[PDB]
Amino acid sequence: DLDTHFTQYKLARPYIADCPNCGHSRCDSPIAIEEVRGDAHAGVIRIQTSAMFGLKTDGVDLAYMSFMNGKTQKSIKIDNLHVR
Amino acid sequence: DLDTHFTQYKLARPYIADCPNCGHSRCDSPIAIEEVRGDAHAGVIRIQTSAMFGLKTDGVDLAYMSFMNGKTQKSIKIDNLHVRTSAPCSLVSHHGYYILAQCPPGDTVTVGFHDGPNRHTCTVAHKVEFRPVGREKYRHPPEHGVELPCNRYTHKRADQGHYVEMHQPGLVADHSLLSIHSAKVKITVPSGAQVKYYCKCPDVREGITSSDHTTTCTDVKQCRAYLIDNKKWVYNSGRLPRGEGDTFKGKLHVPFVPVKAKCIATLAPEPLVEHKHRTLILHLHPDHPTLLTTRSLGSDANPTRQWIERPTTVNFTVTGEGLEYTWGNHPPKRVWAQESGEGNPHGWPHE
Amino acid sequence: YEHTAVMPNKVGIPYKALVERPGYAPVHLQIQLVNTRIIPSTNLEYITCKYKTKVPSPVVKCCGATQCTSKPHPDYQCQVFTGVYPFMWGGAYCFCDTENTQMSEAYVERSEECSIDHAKAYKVHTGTVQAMVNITYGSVSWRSADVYVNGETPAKIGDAKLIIGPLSSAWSPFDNKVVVYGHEVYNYDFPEYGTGKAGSFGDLQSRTSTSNDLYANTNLKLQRPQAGIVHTPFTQAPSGFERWKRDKGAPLNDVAPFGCSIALEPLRAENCAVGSIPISIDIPDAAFTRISETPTVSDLECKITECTYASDFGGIATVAYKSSKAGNCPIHSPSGVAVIKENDVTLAESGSFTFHFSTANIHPAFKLQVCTSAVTCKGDCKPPKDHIVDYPAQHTESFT
Amino acid sequence: KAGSFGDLQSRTSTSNDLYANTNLKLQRPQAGIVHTPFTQAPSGFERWK
Secondary structure (H helix, E strand, O other), X not given: OOOOOHHHHOOOOOOOOOOOOOOOOOOXXXXXXXXXXXXXXXXXXXXXXXXXXXXXXXXXXXXXXXXXXXXXXXXXXXXXXXXX | OOOOOOOOOOOOOOOOOOEOEOOOOOEOOOOOOEEEEOOOOOOEEEEEOOOEEEXXXXXXXXXXXXXXXXXXXXXXXXXXXXXXXXXXXXXXXXXXXXXXXXXXXXXXXXXXXXXXXOOOEEEEEOOOOOOOOOOOOOOOOOOOOOOOEEEEEOOOOOOOOOEEOOOOOOOOOOOOOOEEOOOOEEOOOOOXXXXXXXXXXXXXXXXXXXXXXXXXOOOOOOEOOXXXXXXXXXXXXXXXXXXXXXXXOOOXXXXXXXXXXXXXXXXXXXXXXXOEOOEEEEEEOOOOOEEEOEEEOOOOOOOOOEEEOOOOEEXXXXXXXXXXXXXXXXXXXXXXXXXXXXXXXXXXXXX | OOOOEEOOEOOOOOOOOEEOOOOOEOEEEEEEEEXXXXXXXXXXXXXXXXXXXXOOOOEOOOOOOOOOOOOOOOOOEEEEEEOEOOOOOOOOOOOOOOOOEEEEEEOOEOOHHHHXXXXXXXXXXXXXXXXXXXXXXXXXXXXXXXXXXXXOXXXXXXXXXXXXXXXXXXXXXXXXXXXXXXXXXXXXXXXXXXXXXXXXXXXXXXXXXXXXXXXXXXXXXXXXXXXXXXXXXXXXXXXXXXXXXXXXXXXXXXXXXXXXXXXXXXXXXXXXXXXXXXXXXXXXXXXXXXXXXXXXXXXXXXXXXXXXXXXXXXXXXXXXXXXXXXXXXXXOOOOOOOEEOOOEOOEXXXXXXXXXXXXXXXXXXXXXXXXXXXXXXXXXXXXXXXXXXXXXXXXXXXOO | OXXXXXXXXXXXXXXXXXXXXXXXXXXOOOOOOOOOOEEOOOOOOOOOO
16 A cells, blocks of 8 residues: 555545435445446456545555545545445 | 324333244344335335334433343344344334334345344345336336435334324243242233233133233243233234233324335436327337326327337327327326427418 | 307317307307316225235134134234244243144234325216316406306306316216326226225225225235244235236326326316317307497408417418408407417408417418408418427317 | 447547547436436447447
8 A cells, every 4th residue: 555646646635425326315425436447357346436545645555545524534544445 | 202102102112023034044032023114115114123122111212222132121222233124224213113214125124133142133024115106117216317206204203194003012922021920920011011911721811901810820831921011012013912802902103104205216217209290209218117108188098008118219199189198107298289290391381 | 149169178278269149240259178077976985005914913822722803903814823832032922831822813904105195996976076167258358267067057257157068078087986096097997895806906995094994805824934933924915006007907197088187186187188078158148249349351361471380379360351340359260270369359441450379270271250250361380390298279179 | 320339439549539429318316416327328349249
């Protein structure tokens, strides 16, 4: 877990979003899924959350998770994420 | 929370009932799901667990969790509870012994907390459905398309609109009920209940009574482990018999009645209301079964049934006073007659 | 004088008919019939709605013969089972251990959905209720009030006591037995309360949704629990209310005749789009305009100056009127052959005066009854662009 | 050439411009949700084999 192309990371902030479906009565999640790239013929998926995990605003690690709570970040660990 | 229907709410005790599929395809647990209600046209199901989450016996919070271990409560946090269907629900509110939860559709209902001497979960089959109000056929509505007037259960609690009889709860198994009074087998109450107790040995067994008691025949299996409620009511179930004799009245509302709301709802991707001369050609582009049907506005009825889930230009020969066209339970179209051809001149050098 | 009119019932959109008056000069009488409904005398036979096997606690008696006794219900479905004995935390609710018999009982009780957005049966007798009708006229402009469409004395509203139908438009697109349900309203046969069937409509037959009585042939079959402990399965045939989205009895707001569409209603079929209503009116002789106050307009000629074929009232036609007196002139095509929207068109001796209309004919060979002088306002009109919008105002309807 | 070959028509790889008659139809993101659902006809790399 390390961050090198600050093209995406530094020049970004997590952007709050609303999940498209999350039951009948939706949960608002700033990790709302656009641009699924699961069209690999393998079984592996790249997902785009609307959240900018990666850095907090620091210099290192994709090991954090900066999603939006408010207009402000919430820079915590990425290990609570579970793609499945 | 609300105590404006402490009729059910306050006066509700944790109720114990057999599980039919569990840890050997059978276990003893409090939970066991009766009256699953996927009868709404929405996404939400009103469920009765046997266990009485809600308050404890007080008035405060639907976010406690009182199930039966023994005949006694176990009034703890609701954080060990998992309501689920075939996937985890999100709670809406609990009131009494009844929980309303926005659940994904599911063939079964699967509740469970490991707080017992065992796995202590419970599963049972019970039919859940959601479908369009008239016309169309879907199960659970899409995440796209129009919102439209579904039945759906409340976002709130302590309501009423219908009532099911909940007149006397009674006997359920649990030998904490039938303890021993140091020789003879002894009935107990949940929190106070009028118990019309008796055993196989001759005794009175009718009347509104806690004057019926039999100690003559002794054994927990030869006697009626009861909570005859009438001030601690639980919803009536198949795994909750009543005393053989007269009912103790206790008809009680449901505080989770179906109300209108804007459901995420049913309407398959947009139709095209096309027309030529006395004909609605209808280019259609749905992704889901939409009951298209039309009605030629003459004294002809012109019924139609055709599921459209296939993109199709269809036709309905519009009579001389128009046709109406009813693209699912999405709003009716209406169409006059005269002819068209989509803005074709029929002649136009003026006289 | 007495304004006969074959003149359908369309939405509410303004469309005309014409009083051919012979003693005095003709006067228009726009009979725009907004809706008609029937509302026969009726009786609530039973609410239906998809069941819920909402068990009202079993009558059990594990000693000897198990009993089934209904408590505030007419019936209780109860089925004995052996080979099971109650355990739910140990002990047993059964009160004989010398007879291990287990009485599972489950009855159907009305769903909460029965109250709201539900099927609701009726025995429908004989229609008795009015039709909403606009009358604009050439001496009163507009009144849109309900006036009987059947025999029990039609009211006089406007310069027109108007007898509508009987029951033309919404004749009764209902059957004798009717269920009405939200969107799709079903004119569908089913038997009265007490004898219903699970697969057919009226599986649940509760006299009222609230009421603690019903007839529940829902094909409720309890199955025998196994493994030596009690449970109560509900095995039930497909509902007679989940049909209404699959099986059809006739979804009348999508298959109605008479142009009418339907909703949860007490046997009304609102907003018709045919009727060919024979309205017959008693307009007082005074309300007419004289054939001296209005000229004999003959020696006229009418030619469109931009007709519009559509229910769109943009159609115009100058008429080189030639008056033998001169004055005002209510106009309309003879009782619909086109819909004219000028109440009155002025007439002078050797002048020319346009009126407005919409063609209810492909080309405008519609007579225009200019208060004792008919005239064909011939020519040709604007494209028929339209045939996807409401219910027409091109009265004479049978092709428009 | 939507729903066939040339539904996507890019004259450069890793496109920044193309001609896309793919039969792209947006639908309502019901219940106050902010998202874009894309309903699109299958392509010349989803079948035609």
